Every structure is written in C-alpha cells, then in structure tokens.
Amino acid sequence: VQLVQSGAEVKKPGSSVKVSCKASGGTFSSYAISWVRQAPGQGLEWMGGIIPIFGTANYAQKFQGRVTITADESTSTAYMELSSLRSEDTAVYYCARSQVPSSYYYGMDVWGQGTMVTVSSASTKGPSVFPLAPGTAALGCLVKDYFPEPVTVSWNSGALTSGVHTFPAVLQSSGLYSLSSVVTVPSSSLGTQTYICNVNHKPSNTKVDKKVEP
Amino acid sequence: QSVLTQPPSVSGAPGQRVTISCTGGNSNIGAGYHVHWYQQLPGAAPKLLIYGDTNRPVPDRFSGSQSGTSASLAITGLQADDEADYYCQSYDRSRGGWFFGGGTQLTVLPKAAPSVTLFPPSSEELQANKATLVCLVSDFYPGAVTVAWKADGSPVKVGVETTKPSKQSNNKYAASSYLSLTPEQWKSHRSYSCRVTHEGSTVEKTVAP
Amino acid sequence: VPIQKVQDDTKTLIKTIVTRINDISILTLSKMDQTLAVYQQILTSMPSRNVIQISNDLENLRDLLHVLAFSKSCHLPEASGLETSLGGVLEASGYSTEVVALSRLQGSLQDMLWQLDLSPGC
C-alpha cells in the first residue's frame, strides 16, 4: 500500500488550501487516515483523523474550526482543507494510514510523501543572477530575490560537476529567497575555459545563463 | 508546548547505545495507553519504529520500554544511518488525540574546522543600487557554528541573514551568511569581515571596496 | 498486529476502565458496540473530568472491538446508539445520576470481559 499526495501549493493569507491523499492498493475505507503537519524546524503535530467507512472525523483542539477532513471511499481519497491561512501554517502536511484496520491504538504504518504548503504574501518573481568573480580559485553566482522556492543551478549546462556546491537559500526579510552556487577550479584554467551558471526558476519560468569572468 | 516531552538532542559515537525518553502525565503515557516511536530521516516522511511500547514492525537494534509516566527508545550499536529525528506518540485522554512529542534529533558523531569564503558585492549589483557580501562556510563538523560581521572592526547586526548549518553530501556541514548594504554604505567603509567561530577556533575573512 | 494481541489489549483496556470507575467512587460484537455507543451518548450529557475521560476510553474500546470484528470477516458499522429529549428519559427510570450511570457501565464492561473471553459472535 502507498499513499500519494497532491503537489505543493503556495497560498496567500486569508485564502484556503485542500490537500489530497489517494490510495494505491488497499481497503482505504476500513483503515484510519490521520493528518499531521510539520513546520520547518518543528516536530510532528497531530491535526486529526478520519475513518472513511464510518464517515466521522476527529480534530485536534488546536485546529478545530479551521480544518475539515473528508474521505471519498469510491476514489479512496482523503482530503484535508485548511481555511483562513496564516503565516504560521507554512508547513509540510502528511497523511498516514493506521497499522491495524480502524484504530490508531497501534500506530500509523503507511505515511505519505508530504505536501508542502507555503503561506506568504510574496508573489512569484524570477531571480537576479549576479557573478561572484574568482592553487585553486573559487567562482560562483548569486541568485538573489526570487520566490517561491525552488531554483536549480547547473554549470556549463551540466558538464561541470567537480567542485560544485549549491548552498541552501535564505529567506530574506523582504519575503524573497536568495541562493549562492560556487565552484572551485584550477587557477590556470581561468584564462582558457568558460564557466557559466545556468539558473532555472520554474515557478516564474525564468532561465538565466550567466558567465563568471575574472 | 507539546504534551509529551523529549530531549531536544542526543548524541553518540558509532557502536554506542543511545536512549531517548518520552515523559507525560497520567492522562497519556500513564493509564494504559501505549507509546509509539517514529523515525524521520533528513528529508523524508516518518516511519513507524515502535508501536505499543515495545513491538517492532525494523532492526532489533531499536527497542522500546515503558514504565510509569515515561517511555524510552534504545538504539544499540548506533550506526550512521540512525542519525535522524525521533518522535514519540501517545493518546491524550484529556484532549482526546494521539499527540506527538517535541522530538529528539539523534546525531552520530570527527571534528573539522570550517573553510570560509567571502565574496564582495558584484559590480552589476552595485549598478542595480544593491550590495550583498556573501560568506560561505563549508566542510565543518559538527554543525554548531557562529557568524559575526564587522565593518571597520565595529559589529554589524542590521541587514544580516544567516542559515542554520545544513548537511553536505559528505556527511559534514555548510552554511551561508549575507550582509545587505547599499552601494554607498559598502563604499563608505574600508573593510568588511565575516568571522566564523566553530569549537573555539575562528576563521575570519575580509574584503575591501 | 496479531488478533491475539488485539484481544489482550481490549481486555486490558476494559480492566483499566473498570478500575477507573472504581476510583471515581452484551454478547456479540455488534451488541457490545451498540452498548458502548449508548453509554457514550449518556456520558456526553453529564460531562466532568472522569466522565469525558471514560467516554474517550470507550471510543478507543469501540475502535478495538471493530478491529476484532474485521479480523473475524464480518462487518458491523458504527452503531448509532439511541433513536432520540434526553433529560426526561435520563432522570426518570433511567440514568442521569453520574454514579448510577458509571455503575451500569462497569457492569456492562464486566460482562463484555467474560464474553470476549468466550470468543463471541459478530
């Protein structure tokens, strides 16, 4: 058995989101489906559960009034809808099927992949790519002021892999992300070889090929 | 504040036995209701390690026990793969819900001082009326690392954005810090420096307009 | 999980609830589920600390009963309970008195204990 979840979503404060959880070969209705959120750097938080065949759901007191857990036995798919999104809701939401039929008494043994839901007033925007000019030299690119995650960074279109390090982004005070990707190369090759960073930001559909010259 | 309490972090060297605790009251761990344990590896969904206090779905190196208002997970013969977050779960009968604990980050432990690299603002960036000094730290174990900035020797605390040390592909750590300035600010001093402190040893890097 | 361990944990939860009712001072699985649903509906009308706690414990016990039922290849959905004004029936020739309700519930659980030891029907 496997539980497959919908894709990540970016929403604004006040709006709502609905995450799905479809089965992949199981008596989905006889089991219990729990919804658990996890914010970045925080732990698991049991939000609720539901036994589809019975139809009644249960909600943690914390999320009561803002979360709705439903189940469709036909499509064997659970749904968790969160309304009135705040900044604090930014988190990964997991759905988990219990080990024995209709009870959590013995744990939840089949978890989902997780669905990232990001609540921010920031809007989609591409990055500005600036060059970090260089027995070893280090060159790189600064992918500044973009949103939402993620961006991917290649060098020479993938031909360069030795010595590459693409660091994790930082959430600047402006709501936009910034990333750095560096690579270490022989000092003697700066005169002959061309190093170019290919930055890809799919949310804004931007791609930037920027050459880092000494 | 989670109903169940766990140690924020426990650490051991390979082959060592580690114990993670999970304490509550008589409405959860006490009064019969069991304690489950879940393992969450870096960038993955939780997996069920222990259910019903002791039972395993899981290597025999993991085990569980329950006494009074406490439960514990023992990992004997610690391996590199066990480095992960561990969450205990139990049913609270006063709140009516299977609530988790605060979680424990289990670290498997050779020290390594950091390699720092400071990039100054790009000419193009200054022409965009923006300036960003970049301090990249890499190849340092353990994760603990402090970053401080100084312009002409005076501490800078406004416009500093630093990350929590992330795990590299070589099981070590890297981090990044950014100092945001306006071109005039960047040009108005003679030097900027980032200082990276790690296990008492500090690596300082400086750039000048 | 083995069904043997489910039976063991159901009996243990029953004993826990019985001892808790002490501290405050049917036959097939379907009839047990119905009895516990009715007792839940009763306990929800007289909410205290121990009564809310006992109702939640009964919810868990019903979940375990249904685990057993499904292990016996036979369905018995979530029993509704009553047909439904509570106050009237509860006060007169009924329950209402928290102690009387908890005592009737203790007796029903003690009967369920023996019946579960006898591998009852569905």
Rounded distance between C-alpha atoms, residue B58 and residue A107, angstroms: 14
Alpha helices of chain A — where are they, by DSSP H?
A: none
Place of tokens 């029936």: C89
Phi, psi of A100 (to 5 degrees): -85, 175
> Helices C49-71 and C3-24 sit at what angle, rounded to 10 degrees?
160
* Determination technique for this entry: X-ray
Residue B38 near chain A (CB below 8 Å)? yes
Q: Which residues of C touch B91 (CB under 8 A)?
A: 60
Q: Which of C12, C15, C56, C58 to mutate to test the interface with B (most CBs of B within 10 A)?
A: C56
The amino acid occupying position C12 is T
- The fold adopted by the segment(s) B115-207 is Immunoglobulin-like (2.60.40)
Contact: B94, C1; criterion CB under 8 Å: no
Q: Is A107 helix (H, G, I), strand (E, B) or coil?
A: coil
DSSP string, A7-54: --EEE-TT--EEEEEEESSS-TTTS-EEEEEE-TTS-EEEEEEE-TTT
Are the C-beta atoms of residues B163 and B176 closer than 8 Å to each other?
yes
- To what resolution in angstroms was this structure determined? 3.1
Domain ranges of chain C: 3-122
Q: State which H helix or E strand residue C98 sits in.
A: helix C98-117
Establish if A115 touches chain B: CB-CB under 8 angstroms.
no
CATH class, B9-108 region: mainly beta
Residues 6+ apart with CB under 8 A from B146: B196, B197, B198
Q: Is the peptide bond before B155 cis (omega within 30 degrees of 0)?
A: no
DSSP β-bridge partners for residue B132: B180
Residues in a beta bridge with B116: B137
Check if the beta carbon of residue B130 is closer than 8 Å to that of residue B183.
yes
Q: Does domain C3-122 have CATH number 1.10.10.10?
A: no
Domains of chain A with bracketed CATH: 3-119 (2.60.40.10), 128-211 (2.60.40.10)
CA gap C60, B97 in Å, rounded: 11
Scanning the structure block, which residue is given the tokens 């306990």? Answer: C43
Domain assignments of chain B as residue spans, ordered by start: 9-108, 115-207
Q: Which of B53, B92, B93, B99 to mutate to test binding with chain C, by most C CBs within 10 Å of its CB?
A: B93
Q: Residue C74's CB: how many other CB atoms inside 10 A?
A: 13
Phi, psi of A159 (to 5 degrees): -70, -25
Q: Do C20 and B31 touch (CB under 8 A)?
A: yes
Residues of A in contact with C40 (CB under 8 A): none
Three-state SS at B185? helix
Report yes or no: B120 and B135 within 8 Å, Cβ to Cβ. Answer: no
C-alpha atoms less than 13 angstroms from C-alpha of A109 in its C-beta half-sphere: 18
Whether residue C24 contacts residue C43, with contact meaning beta carbons closer than 8 Å, is answered with no
CA dihedral C79, C81, C82, C86 (to 10 degrees): -150
